[PDB]
């Protein structure tokens, strides 16, 4: 049930952030790849095949006491 997104290679790509968040929140956002208009996206440029893969948004309240992430797939061809 992951979002998939799918880029030409050495296209830029915006990939976004699936956290269900709420929009009057300003959250931090942190991205990580996992191995083993619209905010909160991650910028990837010149998309290589190497790009391809699981990404994990995490956004964390301003307070510091909650954080909220999703996950989404990008594939480069």
Avoid: F, H, M
């Amino acid at each position: 049930g992951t979002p998939e997104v799918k880029v030409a290679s050495s296209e830029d790509v915006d990939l976004p952030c699936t956290a269900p968040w709420d929009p009057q929140v300003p959250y931090t956002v942190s991205w990580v790849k996992l191995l083993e208009e619209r905010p909160y996206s991650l910028k990837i440029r010149n998309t290589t095949s190497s790009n391809s893969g699981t990404y994990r948004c995490t956004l964390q309240d301003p307070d510091g006491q909650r954080n909220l992430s999703g996950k989404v797939i990008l594939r480069v061809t």
